Structure formats: C-alpha cells, structure tokens
C-alpha cells in the first residue's frame, strides 16, 4: 500500500457509503461520497428533526479542534435540502486529516423521505470549489495544497453486493482496480466532474453531450427527449406518472448506451442499467434510468456507470480517467 | 341544463382532463383542471421544446381579442415547473366566456417526463387568488362578479374508467351527481381548498390534519411519518430507490382512510386509491399513497378521493361540500 483508502459498502445494491470522521476525537459518520456536490455535512447533536433520530450526530463540545462559525446555510440537491450552519473541525478521511469547513445540519425535513429511509448520516462532496456553497476548497485539493498527498486525485472502485467491497482511494491510482488502459477525458468545466461525450443508444445520437460523473446519483440520468425516443418501440412499460420503467429482464430489444470521444468508447449494456424486481413479478426488471433536463443537455453517469468503470478524478490535470473495473479483487 | 358543464375524460382511473378554449377563434386545448393551483396556462406556438411538439399550441396572432403583457412568469408545482410570459385573451369554459390573464408557456423541460407522457396541453387552476401568481382573480369568482353564473362555486363529478364520463359544473349544484347528503366543511385558509379533518387509519391518527382537496393530484398524499406507520401494517413491495410500492389489488390488509369532522365522516377504500398496473402483472397495483411533508402536517385528497366523493367548491361560503358520488348517471 501507499495511498489512503476508504472502504465502501453497498446500500441496497445500487448506492454505496463510506465512513469518515469529524472532530479531533474522530467522531465517525457514514457518508454518501458524492462527486456531484462540493460540501461536507453531518447531522448535529443540535438537530431537532425526526430524520436525525437514527443517525450519528456531531457534538462540537467533544472536540478541542472545533472552531465556531455559525453562518447559516442551506444545502440544495436535486433530491432534497438540508440546513444548518458552518463549523470548522478536523476531518479525517482514511488516516488523512485536515482542518475543514463543513455544515452542521440541524434540519433534515427537506430531505425526506430519503434521509429517514436511508442509513447514511451525511454527504461528503468531492466536486470542485465553484460547486460549493461557502467557497470551500475541495478536501483532496486542500490536502495536496498542504502536501499531505502526492496527487490531487481520487479514485472510485465500487462495491458489488455479493462479490466484493469497494474503495475510494485518495492520492494515487492503483492498478489492482481496473483492467486494460485508463482513458482520460478533460473536464469541460471545473464544477461537476463533467466531460463532453457523444451519447448514442438507438439510432438516437446526442453529439457533445455534457456528461456528469456522479457517485451520488443512483441512476443513469438522461435528457427527457432522449429517454422518450429511446423507449419508443422497446416493450418497456412506463407506469403512468411514475419514473418507473418495467421490462422483461431478457427483453431482446434493450439497447446499449454508447458514450464516445476521440480518446475512448464507454458502453453501458442492459446488465448494468437494469435492476431485478423479481418480487414485483417473475423475470421483471426496471430500467435504472430517469429523465432529467438541465439547461444544457446532460447525462448523469451515476452509480450504474461507475459500477462498470473504475474512475479517476484528477484535479491537477482537470480530467476524468476511465477504465473497466476488475470484476474481482 | 341551466349550469355550465364541462365534460371530463378519464386517464387510466388516475387523472382526468377537460377541454377549454383560448382566443376568439376556437383553438381547443385539453387541461388538467386543478383545484390545487390558481393559474391558467397553455403552451405557446413560440414553444419549440420536444414536449410542445406533441401539443395543441396557442397562436396569439390568430386572435383579435388578444392583448399583450409579456411579463415573465415561472409557474412552480410539486411535480415540476413551466415558464413563459403573461398574456390576456378570451378564455371560454363550456358555454361561458371572459377576458382573462393567463400564461403562454415556452419552456416545459422542468415538467418532463410527465408533460410529454400525458395528453393534456395545459393546466387550468381553480384555487383562490392568494395561490395565484400575478394576483389573478379565479375564473369562477370573476364569472359570478360579471353575472354569468348564479353562484361563485364549481363542482366536480369525476369520470370512472369503463363506467361513465364526468363533469366540471360551474355556477350551481346538481343532484344528479350524488346520493345522500352534502356535508360542508369550512376552509381553514383561502388558498388551497383546504379543510381540517381528523385523519385516521386504525390507531394511526392525525387529528385536525390539514387536508387539501386537489383535482390535480393523482395520489393520496400523506405525511411521510404517517405513511411509514401505515407501511408497518403491510407487506407491500417497495420499488428500488423510489418512494412507490407494489401490492396485489385484493390485499385485504390495505388501509381504508377515515377522515372525520364534526359534520361528517369520509372513508377511502383501496378500490379508490390504488393505481392498477395490469400491464405489469394480473391484479397488481401501485399503492398510490405518497409521503409528502408540508410545513404543517397535510394530506392531499387527490383524484382518488374525488372519484368517490362528489365535491363542491364554494367561494361565497368559503367551504368544500362533500357527498358520495353517484356510481353512474
């Protein structure tokens, strides 16, 4: 070894969590590690809302390195909102640590039912500074600026439920996690980990699509028009008014997503975007895809993409590295 | 006869639509007639979004009665957002007509994929003035102020698939639509059509709950905590990472809602609220009870409630009248 690793455990076969600590007394929390945001938050002992009941809670009084701030702040995600106030304390990811500005959340009611239905405590953003609220330098950037890691990069190797755990690796790239070569794609903006790829599924093509690589999204997210055309004659049932797309798992018509650049070609076959729902009915699957429109046509390459492809998030070189993940360690 | 009636058509026993016209020429449109909002909007001919390409579009240059405004408006709903600009024109509802402020929508992507998947063109709000954007007096209020109708009230007899069509009746109450007594519940606020009822499912009780009677909602919506307690008494199948559940339609343990006031008792059995998904499996249903947290503990009595109960929306007396709907006309 040489790089620091946070072990990742799957949540309900699609998302994944990892643990980190806040305070000089190493108060532990379970996090969604989220390349699609850029703020760290943990629920406070000062939380009053029902969603905090089952959570680990941060107690600033128990940490000598706590530094008061108290600036109020609301953190908004596509899926919900939490609010509280800024604080500063030692954040420990792996056995790397640094003083860090984060949000003590005291109100989680804007993040229900998700928060209560889930077993994470907080979210640890891994995006770029401009995506942050409160102008926070990213953890991995600060760590390299303070010379605590070799490279301002991190790496995701996602867990698979029955097979193996996953790792968030900070500071370096480990060959054990992927097969074949890494291909690098330059960021089109330092905001999300967003790259430009042609997106192809049917005879449907969206050239130069904005593709966000987002560990904190459980699905593949697709422009609504693209999705509608995708599903035309696919024998997929959209349950009226629900983003719930049901198919025979062995539906021969299900296409393969193909995202291409000059550098590389990344595909997502049905086996990666289908989720079994045998308890709903025999041989049934749902498409783990949703339609979502951004100002610019955008795909979120969420967990289903990252489950197939090992990913490198390189701040120094402003790029995402992609390689086929090893099926087994 | 003698009241203004607008025929209503069912969509999969889950929503309903009615037609109205805009401009002095015909220009027909299909609307969600929505007691939970207070604005009228139609997709403009200036809308080039993929959603609008499948819709009947409003051309303001084809109407002499049109008068420009152009003030930018964003309309927000729980289920999405559309944007455009205010216009004014002759809005014809049934055989009645009046000059009226409405929105020409030019962006619909924040309302996808529901907009494209559905066959309605726009939404006609039937709420109170304080709910509107641009302080628009409700159509029915203005119609009674202009002496086109006897009473500032409207009435909903919802269609039931394979049984009968329905009607939105403006100006008066017709006995043909219901059996037994009407019971009037006073509004707790002039905003939504919102009344106070004790809501109970067994020992799960929320006394003096805020209950919004909403024709534009396809589910029964309950506080998330309330849904969680109800789910403890069921063995339904949760859809992976979605707040939706699958059941056999004949699951005898499915809850019957009971809503009680000093004046009346209302019940809603599974036969009314479940969403059938026969195209996924025989006798399969979505639970169609959705957790939704308002600042105040709130139930939305959506279409499922209104399919069972004929409803009278009385501006003059600030009340909702409730009676058992006739099973067939």
């Amino acid at each position: 070894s040489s790089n620091d690793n946070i072990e990742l455990v799957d949540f309900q076969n699609i998302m994944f969590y990892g643990d980190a600590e806040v305070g000089d007394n190493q108060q532990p929390f379970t996090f969604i590690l989220d390349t699609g945001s850029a703020n760290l938050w943990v629920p406070s002992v000062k939380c009053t809302t029902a969603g905090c009941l089952t959570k680990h809670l941060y107690d600033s009084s128990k940490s000598r390195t706590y530094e008061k701030d108290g600036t109020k702040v609301e953190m908004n995600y596509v899926s919900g909102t939490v609010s509280g106030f800024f604080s500063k304390d030692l954040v420990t990811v792996g056995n790397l640590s640094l003083p860090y500005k984060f949000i003590e959340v005291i109100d989680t009611n804007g993040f229900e039912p998700t928060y209560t239905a889930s077993t994470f405590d907080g979210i640890l953003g891994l995006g770029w500074k401009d995506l942050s609220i409160g102008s926070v330098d990213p953890i991995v950037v600060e760590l390299k600026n303070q010379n605590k890691i070799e490279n301002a990069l991190f790496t995701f190797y996602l867990p698979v439920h029955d097979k193996h755990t996953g790792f968030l690796t900070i500071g370096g790239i480990e060959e054990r996690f992927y097969e074949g070569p890494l291909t690098y794609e330059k960021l089109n903006h330092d905001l999300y980990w967003q790259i430009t790829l042609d997106a192809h599924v049917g005879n449907i093509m969206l050239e130069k699509a904005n593709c966000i690589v987002d560990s904190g999204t459980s699905a593949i997210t697709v422009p609504t028009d693209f999705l509608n055309k995708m599903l035309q004659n696919l024998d997929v049932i959209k349950v009226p008014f629900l983003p719930f797309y049901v198919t025979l798992c062995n539906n021969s018509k299900l296409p393969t997503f193909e995202f291409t650049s000059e550098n590389g070609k990344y595909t997502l076959e049905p086996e990666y975007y289908l989720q079994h729902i045998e308890d709903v009915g025999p041989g049934l699957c749902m498409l783990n895809i949703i339609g979502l429109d951004f100002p610019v046509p955008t795909f979120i390459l969420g967990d289903p993409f990252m489950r197939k492809y090992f990913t490198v998030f390189d701040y120094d070189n402003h790029s995402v590295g992609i390689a086929l993940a090893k099926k087994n360690l | 006869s003698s009241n203004d009636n607008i025929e209503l058509v069912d969509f999969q026993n889950i929503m309903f639509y009615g037609d109205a016209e805009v401009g002095d020429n015909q220009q027909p449109f299909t609307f969600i007639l929505d007691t939970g909002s207070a604005n009228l909007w139609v997709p403009s001919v200036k809308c080039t979004t993929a959603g609008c390409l499948t819709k009947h579009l409003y051309d303001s240059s084809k109407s002499r009665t049109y008068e420009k405004d152009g003030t930018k408006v964003e309309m927000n709903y729980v289920s999405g957002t559309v944007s455009g600009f205010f216009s004014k024109d002759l809005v014809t509802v049934g055989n009645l007509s009046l000059p009226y402020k409405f929105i020409e929508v030019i962006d619909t992507n924040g309302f996808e994929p529901t907009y494209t998947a559905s066959t309605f063109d726009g939404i006609l709000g039937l709420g109170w003035k304080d709910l509107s954007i641009g302080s628009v007096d409700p159509i029915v209020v203005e119609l009674k102020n202009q002496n086109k109708i006897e009473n500032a009230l409207f009435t909903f007899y919802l269609p039931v698939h394979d049984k009968h069509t329905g009607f939105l009746t403006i100006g008066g109450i017709e006995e043909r639509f219901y059996e037994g007594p009407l019971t009037y519940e006073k509004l707790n606020h002039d905003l939504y059509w919102q009344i106070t009822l004790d809501a109970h499912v067994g020992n799960i009780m929320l006394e003096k709950a805020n209950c919004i009677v909403d024709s534009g909602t396809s589910a029964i919506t309950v506080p998330t905590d309330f849904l969680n307690k109800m789910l403890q008494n069921l063995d339904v199948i949760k859809v992976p990472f979605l707040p939706f559940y699958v059941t056999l339609c004949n699951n005898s343990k499915l809850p019957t809602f009971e809503f009680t006031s000093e004046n009346g008792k209302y019940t809603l059995e599974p036969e009314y609220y479940l969403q059938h998904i026969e195209d996924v499996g025989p006798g399969l249903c979505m639970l169609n009870i959705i957790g939704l947290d308002f600042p105040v503990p709130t139930f939305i009595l959506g279409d499922p409630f209104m399919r069972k109960y004929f409803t009278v929306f009385d501006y003059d007396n600030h009340s909702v009248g409730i009676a058992l709907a006739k099973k067939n006309l």
Partner: peptide, 6 residues
C-alpha cells in the same frame, strides 16, 4: 432514485 447539488 437519488440525485445528489443544485
């Protein structure tokens, strides 16, 4: 589903 920042 879940989609993580605005």
């Amino acid at each position: 589903x879940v989609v993580x920042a605005x």
